[PDB]
Symmetry: D2
Subunit: 330 residues, 4 copies
């Protein structure tokens, strides 16, 4: 018998519509409901027994921490049901990478959780969403998908939710990871070539069920002639930790260092990421004396991903050395 898969719809370009078939870049996100999304891929019925549920209808650049929590807690509920074998989430692409990393850290289940979007609205010619959705249900349907962490299925690939990032605009190959795809999905079949090495889902020390609301964490960008202005304003407005999106290896301008020392003395966690996001990672004590200043290094995680990990980490700890540990395992 077919697996039981629930599609949780959250909006996005995959649910969007444009004026004509020629409109693949200019359209409205989050205009179509989950039942109409489902009826557009009749071939779904042959993969799984599927049901749809509209959680929200948003354009994903306008997502809030509360939306995240509400999504997280609805996933946890479905994962708890015997009636559910896998979960597919349809999501806008802009912050898909943030939602997928969140769910990877806090859902303690090894049922397949698959996040899926599209780079063209369903009304464009050569719209990518139908096969992307098919593939998502195909991977969520598969017993081989269990225990692999949160997965995203776009462009015929199986990408890890941890480190897949929207790296290329316009094109359907928008999502890349520095460490490669985990496998591919072709004609309903999954093919695996690599496994995750970082902690996730069922071996996570975090749990969406214990989390009532997330700490405020914000990101400041760095570049030539940058001042401490945005750093202090964000901290003043209540940020519990600041992600520093540095040049190069999380480097900090000499004019900004003292602001960060004092912000740290005042209890704000300082996490050194970078805007050098195709590969490599930020080294502890290389650019700055992190031990001396009690700063944390975000390893390979880009700024918007380092924010998600910091938020979740800080529901359990505000020890800087523990936060570094967490940035080195997850």
């Amino acid at each position: 018998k077919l697996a039981n898969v629930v599609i949780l719809a959250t909006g996005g370009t995959i649910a969007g519509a444009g004026a004509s078939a020629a409109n693949s870049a200019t359209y409205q996100a989050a205009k179509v409901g989950v039942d109409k999304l489902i009826a557009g891929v009749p071939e779904l019925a042959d993969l799984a027994n599927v049901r749809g549920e509209q959680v929200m209808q948003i354009a994903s650049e306008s997502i809030t921490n509360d939306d995240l929590l509400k999504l997280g807690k609805r996933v946890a509920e479905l994962a708890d049901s015997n009636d559910v074998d896998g979960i597919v989430i349809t999501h806008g692409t802009d912050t898909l990478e943030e939602t997928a990393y969140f769910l990877n850290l806090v859902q303690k289940t090894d049922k397949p959780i698959v996040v899926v979007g599209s780079m063209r609205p369903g009304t464009a010619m050569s719209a990518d969403g139908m096969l992307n959705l098919y593939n998502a249900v195909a991977v969520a349907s598969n017993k081989d998908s269990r225990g692999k962490g949160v997965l995203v299925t776009m462009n015929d690939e199986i990408q890890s939710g941890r480190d897949v990032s929207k790296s290329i605009n316009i094109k359907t190959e928008a999502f890349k990871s520095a460490w490669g795809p985990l496998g591919m999905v072709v004609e309903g079949k999954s093919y695996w070539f690599r496994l995750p090495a970082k902690r996730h889902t069922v071996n996570s020390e975090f749990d969406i069920k214990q989390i009532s609301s997330l700490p405020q964490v914000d990101i400041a960008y760095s570049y030539g002639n940058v001042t401490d202005t945005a750093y202090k304003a964000l901290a003043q407005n209540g940020a519990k930790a600041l992600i520093h999106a540095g040049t190069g290896n999380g480097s900090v301008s000499s004019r900004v260092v003292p602001a960060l020392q004092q912000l740290r003395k005042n209890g704000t966690q300082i996490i050194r990421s970078s805007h050098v996001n195709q590969g490599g990672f930020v080294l502890r004590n290389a650019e700055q004396p992190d031990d001396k200043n009690d700063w944390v290094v975000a390893h390979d995680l880009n700024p918007e991903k380092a924010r998600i990990l910091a938020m979740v980490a800080m529901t359990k700890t505000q020890d800087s050395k523990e936060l570094q540990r967490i940035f080195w395992e997850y």
Copy 2:
């Protein structure tokens, strides 16, 4: 009888030093003088007559707008001299991509200007700097290099200064461009496979000789649950233009749109870039009604690149349609 090449030293990792040969990532930048960089590559003498000049000695994450104007001016002086065939600038890698684009925009010469750094200090084993310096002089020595715009020579490649970006940390292949290298340099010899399509150097409408002050331009990051806080703070502290580093196709959160509209009415330019920096570009009037709000789209340029262009363009105009034209040509 060889070409005459001036090396302008500004500091950086090429001039950096570490504790041992094993220290390829933990070291101090800007430790060695230009005369020592040159003496360390005696083979330079077969490529050209080289003289060195120490302009500054900085780690490139700490560069200021004055540093830029002082470098640009010294480059213009040297380019005017007849005893100068080519110019090589040694630079730290962190903001190398910012200086390179700046000089591409404001040096109205077609003499070769070559910016070069290194990903390893010269004390580390397998240091990349000696060969990078050698290739920089080889490219600047070459008449084929003239009229190509500013060039950067690392990793055996000839990259365009316009859109080469530090994309990968730690590794020697740090610098990539979405549109590919222009050619390669192998054993003193240059090989070309593409030409620039964008306006630069001699056909730029900008001239460093007519620029003695640059306007303040700052960058704000966008992500899930971002607020208008950093945008407002940056504007209050003097930003004449804001580079919005948006998710996706320069998308703007629903709760940041109102503050952006207001900052534009108060006269600060709103330039929509993105943190999706491996390929593609941000399309005018797709995510936001730019025409209606009088905002500008940064095309394919990443946030720090779009800062450099906005800063140079606004020495000459504050019309937003002029600004959009410039972002579509350079």
Copy 3:
């Protein structure tokens, strides 16, 4: 008024059909005619006045030199007509890269010639062919496309016919170039970022009109424990030149060197390419003494592209030093 564009159909996956919408990889190529291809993109009518012509209906792995010549000569005829502004060729993907380089070398016109395929048959869900075709007619329609060489429009990119290669199986981003795309096509609009630097079309020394039939040229693969067997068999069966697909930098096994010396003494041109095809290029006199042995080096061209250039070159010359020149300009 609209430009006049002719679509020459040659078969391929873009004209293919599968059993169901789920069949994106298992289908029949070259099953649909050009008039039905045209009727499936009604939006074409708004770009150009288009007419279709079925030149052949093949799967492109089974193309012959005669097919190439017949295609080449029909293009030349259309390019000569006042009634024709641009030409689009629909082609299977397997040898698309070979046809596109051929046309780049021998069509002396600067009217837009656009080659286009698809990685999924038109019957698959999320089939890429409709937008690919649209984009092809959009680029062929555009006066800015003139004088750029032969172009291929897939995956929203504008790729050079010279060095675009099918590099990735299954995925719609199959086609890559070592030197980057030239630009992109979005919603009918073209955006350019680079220009060609190698000789082509209107500045080619070759001309399809003088060519009655092509020399036989064949390719032998190299690897550990390879013998001279395939090299001698191909030469014996009448190959006028052999493309050596070497390991690394066109390297030749010591057991195979004498076979190649003698084959050269016997009049067979020896052209050193490689199966190291993501980037870089083969250097003359690095791996082997090419001057000594009178061999030719294929520069950056992969084996199937080096074959196309050798065939066309040899309709004008059998001088090895001239052949090297040609491999360094085209």
Copy 4:
């Protein structure tokens, strides 16, 4: 008290020497002895106790099947010894990817086996070999390296020996894999981001101790207007299996199909690979009816990689369904 690491020297560019420091691409391989390679990196002594042993001194394009069996046997001997914690093999880059996959298949140990070369001779300026050697010993020294399969450490990366391929000529980043690096090595320290999903070393059904002869396996290239000539010649000269390096998804020309059917009836295995080697894989029964012809598909493996697997698999089986299973697991 440090780990005990044996360096097995086989020659190659790491041991190569050129005329001057500027000679990074024009030089002789296999000139320097293992004792000199080691003496040249005194820092190795902080990582482990190293002893060197010169196994051969070859340029890697000239390697034979005996060379492979002799290396594999010597590796098995050393792996059995208790005085040996890790094994480093210095190798030329040309067929490095072939030896690495061979050892991955037949060494039934989980001690670290690390293969390393260099893209520049050790006499050239900015030679990559010293740091590559250092990192190889650092990775082999590390208990975290055990059970990972054969590893290759170049360009600061830890690449899987299974699917790492020499993909880019000249440049230091020559070796890539479609599925990404497993991790990185920075300043002696290893960082992991992915694990192998494929069978290897200790869970291989193959054992070098039970292999004293390898069957003859050869590769034919496919392209436009290819004939059955090289296929037939290779089979006549002793090939027990043919790797067909097809266009696209291992596609076979219409005029080569009949000769392949006949060669299979005569008992030579037909393995469909491709020269589309950046990503994707060749799908059974898509391009050709493999079931009906009793052919095998090489999955994601490139032609020279599929040669190594077919050669090892056929020491144990000649059933084609067994052969397909093996190509789907290793």
